[PDB]
Amino acid sequence: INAIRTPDQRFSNLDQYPFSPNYLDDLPGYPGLRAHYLDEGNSDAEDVFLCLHGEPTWSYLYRKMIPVFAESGARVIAPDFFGFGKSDKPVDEEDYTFEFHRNFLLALIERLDLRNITLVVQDWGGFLGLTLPMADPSRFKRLIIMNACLMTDPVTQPAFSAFVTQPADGFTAWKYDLVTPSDLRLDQFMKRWAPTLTEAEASAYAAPFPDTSYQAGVRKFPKMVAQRDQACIDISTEAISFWQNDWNGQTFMAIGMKDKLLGPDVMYPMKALINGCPEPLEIADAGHFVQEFGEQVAREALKHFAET
């Protein structure tokens, strides 16, 4: 597995990321690759919030949510996918697959022996994260879901495929923005798709990527939304049955109402598939990256769980 590592100095000037690095080595199926994860709050806590990022972000996306979860007395784990953040980065797009990313998550959960998990998901964090509990249901207790769905086939859930082609300024534009430029500047991309970001914050999304050779993982993600392999279809379809029939944990859903990708059109169908999912918190002004209203969401989720 040909991979490269982002030099440490890229992360020297980060804004509002005071969180210390932790690393995992020799995960099964990932020889030679080192993964970065945050591990915050009481290490001996009973509850763990497992926060999974998506495209084209990293654990930085959860910077506003982590302190809220930590202050409630829980442990918080926020891994960077291989190809992202401070994790090692395979150089060939062909190495990135649904299974590559999924099995990594499973290996990390097992290695850290995470239990009493509150799964917190958005975007690819959800497409992958939502398929984890069925593999080891006894480890998972709660779900916080922000703009996410399952990557099933278009016949099974047309809502989880339609967004790919309409509106033009939605996933079509998103994918175009990510896969076409020779010089992909994620600070500019993130300022576009998360317009509340300051330049300091936006710069943190470019930090992992000195140049295009570090971005194979970034390029591959949208191609996997557009073209879903058989493993992805199968696993995502199995997950539907889990959420509908097997899940009996507590759920909190938050929707970025202005999201052109995975807004109400996608999230209401998703709500219906999750047994016991309450009415969603509708954030009227939020877009795809619901986490930029992250403090609010984390605080409201905690209240909801404490209240029921």
UniProtKB/Swiss-Prot annotation:
Record-annotated AB hydrolase-1 domain positions: 48-294
Keywords, comma-separated and alphabetical: Detoxification, Hydrolase
Regulation (activators, inhibitors): Inhibited by thiol reagents such as p-chloromercuribenzoate and iodoacetamide.
Temperature dependence comment: Optimum temperature is 37 degrees Celsius.
Pathway(s) where this gene product acts: Xenobiotic degradation; 1,2-dichloroethane degradation; glycolate from 1,2-dichloroethane: step 1/4
Extent of the signal sequence: none
Record field: catalytic activity: 1-haloalkane + H2O = a halide anion + a primary alcohol + H(+); 1,2-dichloroethane + H2O = 2-chloroethanol + chloride + H(+)
GO biological process: 1,2-dichloroethane catabolic process; response to toxic substance
Gene Ontology MF: a single term: haloalkane dehalogenase activity
Chain residues that bind chloride: 124, 174
EC number, as in UniProt: 3.8.1.5
Pfam families, sorted: Abhydrolase_1 (PF00561)
Record-annotated active site: 123 (nucleophile), 259 (proton donor), 288 (proton acceptor)
Keyword Hydrolase included in the entry's annotation: yes
pH note: Optimum pH is 8.2.
Function: Catalyzes hydrolytic cleavage of carbon-halogen bonds in halogenated aliphatic compounds, leading to the formation of the corresponding primary alcohols, halide ions and protons. Has a broad substrate specificity, which includes terminally mono- and di- chlorinated and brominated alkanes (up to C4 only). The highest activity was found with 1,2-dichloroethane, 1,3-dichloropropane, and 1,2-dibromoethane.
Family in the record: Belongs to the haloalkane dehalogenase family. Type 1 subfamily.
Subunit structure: Monomer.
The name this protein goes by in its record: Haloalkane dehalogenase
Source organism: Xanthobacter autotrophicus
